[PDB]
Design a protein around this ligand. Structure first.
Ligand code: HEM
Ligand code: HEM
Ligand code: CL
Lengths: 188, 188
């Protein structure tokens, strides 16, 4: 994972579980307890795994729950570090533009296999959003959606439609329903 | 020199002088014209120098001018590879955060005395910025400032105040003036 996101995860873990737990978890994988991860770095995904496993150990929460909580709270971290993505927007357009935003952030990467966050209207008050990747961050994804709702103070209902791994390509499809009609048939 | 930085320079050189100049300059130092530099690699400062010397020879431009133009164009390259440093920012904040950003980038390096890019307000509409290093990349520094102005679409006036060497440490201090007031006296 590119250092840009990993840096936010570290801060977010601190907001959730405290500096003590995070310092100890970082040290447990050989990092300096106050390591600042930058955009120029590429963090080994298995190192991230072990950090999260230590947090699970110290907090007594299942790692799935930790990812959910991190997703939820990481939205606030994003809003502080990169307020530009939030300013002058409402939830529906925010979710709608996530795919584009991530494509911009991943346009340069070596992997050449872009995770996708395609959203599309399926009713006057609902979208389907599909997470497609090789990494299978199911709980993180669900958490980010909740965190978005929380941040924008707009209530939604989320129903999981599909989740499964095909050829390494993990997919998670959700239906998100809003409190007000937001879409209408126009002529393709 | 950090491999990833040299990577940006190679791309920037292609944008400025064409693939032919660069491919041949790379070959002249025994590289593959299409070499991929890892985020963990460093490149010897001397090889960088010889590459630049070849570019100067082929283009017929003084190498000082090449560095100036590379600095100018490299901001664009940085903004493409590392968008998060640029998203939603304005020029003043960007320049003021460079010292910290650079300190975060070369903490791993065995350099027990790092290059510095300290900036400080000296008036409501102006900062002094001082580049201090052993490397004497004067023209690159001035170029990057100009590229920053261009990128953020904020006009500035740059006055070089001092430039010179001492203790093996070269230093270049400029005064940068903005078109309107950006600082003001604040408690403590
Ligand atoms: C301003 C808001 C956001 C920013 C700045 C942001 C930024 C990022 C960045 C930099 C990455 C790393 C991509 C890479 O280098 O591989 C990433 C990954 C990811 N983003 Fe976000 N994100 C935002 C909001 C969201 C939201 C709202 C969702 C879902 C609703 C989301 C879902 C994901 C997921 C699931 C990953 C991991 C994808 C993978 O498996 O590679 N993000 N994000
Ligand atoms: C996001 C934008 C930027 C990034 C990612 C970046 C990154 C880097 C990196 C990785 C180095 C290598 C340090 C080393 O190997 O010793 C470096 C050096 C340098 N940077 Fe930047 N830089 C950025 C913008 C700027 C700006 C705006 C300036 C000037 C205002 C600047 C001035 C310099 C100078 C003068 C050096 C050479 C330092 C020395 O003598 O050792 N950089 N930068
Ligand atoms: Cl649980």
């Amino acid at each position: 994972m590119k250092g840009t996101l990993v840096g936010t995860w570290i801060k977010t873990l601190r907001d959730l579980y405290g500096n003590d737990v995070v310092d100890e978890s970082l040290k447990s994988v050989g990092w300096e307890p106050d390591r600042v991860i930058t955009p120029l770095e590429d963090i080994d995904d298995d190192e991230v795994r072990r950090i999260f496993a230590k947090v699970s150990e110290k907090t007594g929460k299942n790692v799935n729950e930790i990812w959910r909580e991190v997703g939820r709270q990481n939205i606030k971290t994003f809003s502080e570090w990169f307020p530009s993505y939030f300013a002058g927007r409402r939830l529906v357009n925010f979710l709608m533009m996530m795919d584009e935003v991530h494509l911009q952030l991943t346009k340069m990467i070596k992997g050449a296999t872009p995770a996708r966050l395609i959203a599309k209207p399926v009713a006057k008050d609902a979208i389907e959003m599909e997470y497609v990747s090789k990494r299978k961050m199911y709980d993180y994804f669900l958490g980010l959606i909740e965190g978005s709702s929380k941040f924008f103070k707009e209530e939604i209902s989320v129903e999981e439609v599909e989740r499964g791994e095909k050829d390494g390509f993990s997919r998670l499809k959700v239906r998100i329903k809003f409190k007000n009609p937001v879409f209408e048939y126009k002529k393709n």
